[PDB]
Amino acid sequence: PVYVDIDADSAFLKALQRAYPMFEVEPRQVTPNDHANARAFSHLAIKLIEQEIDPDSTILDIGSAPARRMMSDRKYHCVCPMRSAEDPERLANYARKLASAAGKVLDRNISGKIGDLQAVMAVPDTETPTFCLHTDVSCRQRADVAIYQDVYAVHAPTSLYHQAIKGVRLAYWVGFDTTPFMYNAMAGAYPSYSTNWADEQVLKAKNIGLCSTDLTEGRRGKLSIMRGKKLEPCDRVLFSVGSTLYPESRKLLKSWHLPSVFHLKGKLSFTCRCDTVVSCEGYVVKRITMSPGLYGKTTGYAVTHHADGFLMCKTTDTVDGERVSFSVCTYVPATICDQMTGILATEVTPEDAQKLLVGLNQTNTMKNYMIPVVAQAFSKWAKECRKDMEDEKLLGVRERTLTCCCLWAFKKQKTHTVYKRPDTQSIQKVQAEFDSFVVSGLSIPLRTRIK
Amino acid sequence: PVYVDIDADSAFLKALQRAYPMFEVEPRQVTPNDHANARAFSHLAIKLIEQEIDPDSTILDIGSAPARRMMSDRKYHCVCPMRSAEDPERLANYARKLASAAGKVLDRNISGKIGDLQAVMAVPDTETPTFCLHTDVSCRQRADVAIYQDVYAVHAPTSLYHQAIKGVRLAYWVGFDTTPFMYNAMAGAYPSYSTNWADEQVLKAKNIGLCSTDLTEGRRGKLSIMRGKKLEPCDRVLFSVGSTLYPESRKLLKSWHLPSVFHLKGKLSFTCRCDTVVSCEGYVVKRITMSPGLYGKTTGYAVTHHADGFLMCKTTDTVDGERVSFSVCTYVPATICDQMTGILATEVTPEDAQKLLVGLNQTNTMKNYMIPVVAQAFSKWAKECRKDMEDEKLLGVRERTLTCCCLWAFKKQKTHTVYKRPDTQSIQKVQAEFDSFVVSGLSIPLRTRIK
Amino acid sequence: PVYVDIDADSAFLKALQRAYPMFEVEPRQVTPNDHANARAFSHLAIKLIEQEIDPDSTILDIGSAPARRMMSDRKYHCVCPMRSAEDPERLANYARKLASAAGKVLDRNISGKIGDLQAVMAVPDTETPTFCLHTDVSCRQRADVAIYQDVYAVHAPTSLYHQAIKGVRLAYWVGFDTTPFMYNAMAGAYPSYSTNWADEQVLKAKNIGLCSTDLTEGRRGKLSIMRGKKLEPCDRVLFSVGSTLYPESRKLLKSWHLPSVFHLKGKLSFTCRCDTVVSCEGYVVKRITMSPGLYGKTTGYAVTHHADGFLMCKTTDTVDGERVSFSVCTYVPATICDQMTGILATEVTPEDAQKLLVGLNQTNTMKNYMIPVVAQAFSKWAKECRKDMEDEKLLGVRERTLTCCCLWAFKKQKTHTVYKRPDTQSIQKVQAEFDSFVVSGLSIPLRTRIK
Ligand SMILES: C[n+]1cn([C@@H]2O[C@H](COP(=O)(O)OP(=O)(O)OP(=O)(O)O)[C@@H](O)[C@H]2O)c2nc(N)[nH]c(=O)c21
Ligand SMILES: C[n+]1cn([C@@H]2O[C@H](COP(=O)(O)OP(=O)(O)OP(=O)(O)O)[C@@H](O)[C@H]2O)c2nc(N)[nH]c(=O)c21
Ligand SMILES: C[n+]1cn([C@@H]2O[C@H](COP(=O)(O)OP(=O)(O)OP(=O)(O)O)[C@@H](O)[C@H]2O)c2nc(N)[nH]c(=O)c21
Ligand SMILES: Nc1ncnc2c1ncn2[C@@H]1O[C@H](CSCC[C@H](N)C(=O)O)[C@@H](O)[C@H]1O
Ligand SMILES: Nc1ncnc2c1ncn2[C@@H]1O[C@H](CSCC[C@H](N)C(=O)O)[C@@H](O)[C@H]1O
Ligand SMILES: Nc1ncnc2c1ncn2[C@@H]1O[C@H](CSCC[C@H](N)C(=O)O)[C@@H](O)[C@H]1O
Ligand SMILES: [Mg+2]
Ligand SMILES: [Mg+2]
Ligand SMILES: [Mg+2]
Ligand SMILES: [Mg+2]
Ligand SMILES: [Mg+2]
Ligand SMILES: [Mg+2]
Ligand SMILES: [Zn+2]
Ligand SMILES: [Zn+2]
Ligand SMILES: [Zn+2]
């Protein structure tokens, strides 16, 4: 019996039960959290990871929040480099909770944990069994398992290699699905988790999930010094989970979209296998095994299975008054996708598609703020399919036109919707051979306060 | 079991229960208060804050109403600078209640409270454990927790820094949502709390919630000495909560719209994290942690999650006979917003939208005095969406026109409505690095009366 | 259990129960009073005031009717200057009732009351504990509470200052709502209380609540010596409550529309807070706290919260044969206002609006004699809204036209209806800084009769 802080009548309960059939999920609502579903998924994921691994194993918790591991019988070594502004609060919460359980919880090594915390406070660079202030690449604690829970600030191959050279043979990554960033979308939603993310350039849009614009009265102006003739995704994105905001980097996010098999070639060499073991409406748990030596061959292909529909479409919005178009991604429940199979046989207008989608949403199966764009997406998709049926080609042929050179062109059709239906797979060519991994943050007053 | 002075059949009861799932909310109506909902929310909020914090903590109550902390087992130090015209009544009520419970309540430190009150009356500058006549920046009582309950007259960063340099590590702010003032609206409503606020310039309007106009026949006159060619929001706004009026300053209101993480850089430096822990139909409880030292990096982005729809729209009204347009904001129940998803797929006239909204309101889900403006808003929003669909742009392009200089302009489209649907987030760029905080009010007759 | 002399089936019972939730209101009809609702409200108001205040307090009763305080256990000092023509009757009734309970009621100080009455009859200037013949500004009895029950003949700031310099710190005012006289209406109704008031100039109208006209054939005559080219509200108004008539002065009526906070600056200075604690369909109880010393700042704004709709509209009537137009105010039940929200989305003729209002009135929710003008009002309001929608302006602009001078006029639109919907607030700028308060009525044989 695992108790999750979500509403009893919530429809995410069924999705969580299907995602974790080996547990008895029961709702025990105690707080009005606006990101309750994400926390519930993380809780169930760490429970599953603990179930899978050997009790005698020692687990590195990279980018840890130590207050969450303090009621765990497992042997966690929490790596806390204090690199984020929210970290001091987490460390203070850990210290307060340890003090509150100092002589009242017996078999959770609370005395050992407070001793290690005081030792790290005394000598910053000491490596205690349960705590340290180092990073993933500077910690010296050898272990058998590594866990990354909502860690997006590390390059995946470098961190994984640095764990592997320390004897780590199993790694676990819990996070948001990295597929929408492999498609290079400008903005997007994980609607089941009340999560909206956007490129920094489109934060002033009007109709995406995460934006804020102003009311204006029109001008042929807004002159600027930046010749922004092109609107393309840049590295910095903003995540909003419920109401908490997190900046992310696209390279770091995409690094965690690892292939099925890859090779880390350093002073030591490792053959690694990445596998998505849990997938619930945009939240995934990935298992990475690492074995010394080079074995087999790598194709460099990462595959995402779509239990629910995944949409990326073009949207026309108004950013700071200026009308632009950019790609927006979302997830659509598989029941909604199945109920639109017959409608998309014909060309449908976005208004008719929206009306049908609202009909299928009756309570609501999917969030309504994403219904318009989805409708638009579907409409475009339907039209494009007709185009393909209308302009049928010949087998074994590919029409090419010369351009007065030893080089030839052809026509690229317009594609305004990528629609991965339920039971399909996205396949992306990514790097699979990594060989270049060669590429003191606590203050005295915080030290005094922790004591 | 927490008892709230609201009607048993009130629909706000379900909203309060959802906002506070950790309590058993029971209606016990004893007075015909016209701002009963706001008082009920404040009561439940202080109960939640008391639940969260350690009993041995000492709590600064900034801008306190000491009569409300008098039946509390917690250790409150009430800071009462007596800068409001409603403060003498509150102090007299506190003294009268203390006298009425001097020898009837045993375990609430009533004797201590009367002793401290008499001590401050004797020597005004004395700093007693439970009472003082200083301000937030002149009080000397060190504490661990600070509470701001309906305090809008202080600059947030300066006050928080002055608490932090006194050892305060946790602060709580209970008050009306600051999002409508981040959008620079001229007038607005919190309809669930019977609250209407307006800029001082539009108090003579006709159809906003808080206004009063006269009956006129129409003249080509009203000549004035002030060249008012622009109608823009000014600093002073008027709040009417039920029937009690409060003047507010826009800058002080907006200062409390703090980012997720920020830095206070003074003689001491603090890394602070602001989090909205309670959000109920326009009334919020925010939790601010403060930790010494500078950690991490700040983006300067403040995020509001919209459980219910938030609307800002253009309204045409008559102020002192003169027809003008200004922005008006409001909150719309999420069920109403969901029920209008299908209708807003096409362009709808404001009259048809109003009739539909009246239909969905049957008892009433939302206040009727806001239905017209909301209807108008929806209509405009629908229209604008279609325009965006009609004038579709190209990906990665941004049309710009030169003006015989090293500058290029473009066309800014129409925005008469900002509609944040349920499960979306507003994101605003605000200051996150604060480093300039360097920027005796009791008379003898009141001293004699208090004794 | 409070018993009210009203009909058991009266619909005012529910309104009174909502206005006084702290009491059990039971109808005990004993007389066919035509102003039974007003008397019932006054009875419940004095009960609530008595409940609120400390039993050991001494209560000034300004402009008292001593027969009503005579079965009161509280310590009332009745101030009876005998300036009204209905006062000798009240004094005789008081003496008769005292005699009738001289040796039959033991614990109501009847012997003391008759002793004080005989003392004042002997020496008119003596200040006895329970009775005096002075005014509010000439009484010398110091007290802690003052009560004004249906007192409209005194300037509010001067009377309140004279009470405050006598140690009075709490004052209560029970009376008809002063909002209709802040809007400067010519005639009006409190229909729940069967009350109609009119300006003296329109007493000869035809279709207002309080008027009487004659039957005429119609002539091009009625010459007069007064160039009455203007019809404006003058000071004198006539109230008819049921069938009892009372002349009132507009200045004295409006003086009691006090701001939320104000300052009395005389030889002593007081900071006063006015708050409306009871509001029932036009009858209000206001609480005024007074504290010595000047504190805070005053805005000068008085706010009225509308639980029911408030209408002021232009009506065309026939006064003494001459067709004129003037403003008429009234209250509309909130259920009627809510049921007309959808209808007022479009332009509706007064006849269709009247038929709809008669339909919603089925027993009757509102008085029928007020339905026509209300209908007309709604119609005009609807039309005006359309105009505001039709003539949409630009944000941040205000069109002004020069007149060959350093002055610029503009166009003032028509306003034929002020409609304060339920859950709105009227805000009026009134005086809040008062500093100029510097601005023997019993005969020998009434004395002999009283003995
Ligand atoms: C550290 N972190 C956490 N999340 C997600 O946001 C949710 C809350 O993230 P949180 O760090 O605010 O949890 P907190 O310590 O405040 O404790 P709680 O409020 O009781 O939950 C988590 O469930 C994650 O799914 C995160 N999401 C992104 N994109 N980036 C991050 O760094 C990140
Ligand atoms: C001090 N203050 C209180 N409020 C809100 O108005 C409501 C009443 O505010 P109040 O100060 O009038 O309460 P009072 O002391 O009269 O006791 P009560 O009548 O029994 O409640 C509160 O619930 C607040 O939500 C306030 N609202 C604004 N905008 N500004 C303020 O300063 C302010
Ligand atoms: C003194 N006075 C009383 N009223 C209202 O008129 C009603 C009756 O006023 P009343 O003075 O005629 O009561 P009376 O002494 O005759 O005893 P009763 O007939 O049993 O009630 C009261 O309920 C008041 O609401 C009053 N109304 C106005 N406008 N002016 C006044 O001076 C005034
Ligand atoms: N290079 C690095 N090596 C190890 N940890 C790092 C790191 N860069 C950032 N981090 C840490 O990663 C953390 C992400 S916040 C993590 C919260 C916690 N893991 C949870 O499950 O809720 C930050 O606290 C930051 O300190
Ligand atoms: N600079 C300042 N420092 C501390 N308090 C201040 C202040 N400026 C104004 N105040 C106080 O803030 C109060 C707001 S009224 C507060 C009422 C009370 N907190 C409640 O919960 O109902 C006023 O009484 C005023 O005295
Ligand atoms: N200046 C003044 N000071 C005190 N009382 C005054 C006054 N001017 C008029 N009054 C008194 O106010 C009274 C209004 S009739 C009041 C009736 C009584 N208060 C009731 O509740 O029914 C008159 O009797 C008149 O004598
Ligand atoms: Mg959150
Ligand atoms: Mg497998
Ligand atoms: Mg109020
Ligand atoms: Mg949080
Ligand atoms: Mg009568
Ligand atoms: Mg109040
Ligand atoms: Zn380590
Ligand atoms: Zn202090
Ligand atoms: Zn007297």
Residue numbers in the entry:
A (entry chain X), B (entry chain A), C (entry chain C): 3 to 364, 376 to 452, 458 to 469
Passage from the reporting paper:
Enzymatically, nsP1 also has a role in addition of cap0 structures to the 5′ end of the positive-sense viral RNAs. NsP1 possesses both N′7 methyltransferase and guanylyltransferase activity and reverses the order of these reactions. Each nsP1 protomer is built around a methyltransferase fold common to SAM-dependent methyltransferases with additional insertions (membrane binding and oligomerisation (MBO) loops 1 and 2) and extensions (ring aperture membrane binding oligomerisation (RAMBO) domain) that contribute to pore formation, oligomerization, and membrane binding.
To investigate guanylylation of nsP1, the second step of the reaction, we acquired structures of the protein with SAH and m7GTP in the absence of magnesium, a cofactor necessary for nsP1 GTase activity. As expected, we found that both ligands occupy the active site in a state corresponding to the postmethylation reaction but prior to the m7GMP transfer to the nsP1. However, the definition of the ligand and SAM binding site densities drastically improves, suggesting that the ligands are more stably bound together and that this induces an ordering of the active site. However, there is a slight rotation in the SAH ribose and base, resulting in an ordering of the αC-β4 loop and bringing the side chain of conserved D138 within H-bonding distance of N6 of the SAH base. R92 and R275 of the neighboring protomer move in to directly coordinate the alpha phosphate aligned with H37. This contact provides direct evidence that oligomerization is required to complete the GTP substrate binding site, explaining why nsP1 monomers are inactive for GTase activity. However, it is immediately clear that the substrate is not correctly positioned for nucleophilic attack by the catalytic histidine for guanylylation of the enzyme. Mg1 appears to coordinate the oxygen atoms from the beta and gamma phosphates (Pβ and Pγ) O2B and O3G, respectively, and a second Mg2 atom appears to coordinate the catalytic H37 and D36 sidechain at 2 Å and 2.3 Å distance.
